[PDB]
């Protein structure tokens, strides 16, 4: 890789600089280089990886949605191949980033992740990036892409329920995202609502065990669960 000659610590340092500079493509490239050094990632390093790639793919997804909406309107009752071509260009770039992230997870982050906090984190990411692939998929593999997202989220859920308290931020964020998967990918709004509600209620009951700082972390994600429930009901 293009980062193969840079020290791991220098890649991490530069990823943090890139985050301060809002240079998310660079941030993601630095973190990919760090992953490819072959050592496990710390909690902070996992967070950097996930923020970097989310910012990259988030811009691509937002652009894809704009272009898809224009393409839909241009195919209604009442201008050539350009809109489709450009939507396809953005789509292919987005798929490439998802494939890159999934490849880092498969080679070899997931297989080396034994602690619950790392294993759940990476399986959640795997579900998230298959979910982004599912948002744009239309071919013979669409159902398999959706099931790949589901299977990754489900394994992460099973581990999180056995090994983490209900207020753990990774567990909460996993539930938030898996609930969105149910709502808008799997066409299962009742499952989405049930998951968000039980997750919220079980976290509420465990807040009493937390310090002020942990309480702040957990309640922030709980508020997102509540926001989604308010939107959906």
């Amino acid at each position: 890789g293009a980062m193969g000659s840079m020290e791991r610590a220098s890649l991490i340092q530069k990823a943090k600089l890139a985050e301060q500079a809002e240079r998310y493509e660079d941030m993601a490239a630095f973190m990919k280089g760090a992953v490819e050094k072959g050592e496990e990632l710390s909690c902070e390093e996992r967070n950097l990886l996930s923020v970097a790639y989310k910012n990259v793919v988030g811009g691509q997804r937002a652009a894809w949605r704009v272009l898809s909406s224009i393409e839909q309107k241009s195919n209604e009752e009442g201008k050539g191949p350009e809109v489709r071509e450009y939507r396809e260009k953005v789509e292919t770039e987005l798929q490439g980033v998802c494939d890159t992230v999934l490849g880092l997870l498969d080679s070899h982050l997931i297989k080396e992740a034994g602690d619950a906090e790392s294993r759940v984190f990476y399986l959640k990411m795997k579900g998230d990036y298959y979910r982004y692939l599912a948002e744009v998929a239309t071919g013979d593999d669409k159902k398999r892409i959706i099931d790949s997202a589901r299977s990754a989220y489900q394994e992460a859920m099973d581990i999180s329920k056995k090994e983490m308290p209900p207020t753990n931020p990774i567990r909460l964020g996993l539930a938030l995202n898996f609930s969105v998967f149910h709502y808008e990918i799997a066409n299962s709004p009742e499952e989405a609502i049930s998951l968000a509600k039980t997750t919220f209620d079980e976290a509420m009951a465990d807040l009493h065990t937390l310090s002020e700082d942990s309480y702040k972390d957990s309640t922030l994600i709980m508020q997102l669960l509540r926001d989604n429930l308010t939107l959906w009901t």
């Binding site: 989310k54 988030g58 964020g173 995202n177 808008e184 926001d227 989604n228």
Partner: peptide, 9 residues
């Protein structure tokens, strides 16, 4: 719109 985490920006 509905929330997922991480968020961008």
């Amino acid at each position: 719109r509905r929330a997922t985490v991480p968020w961008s920006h």
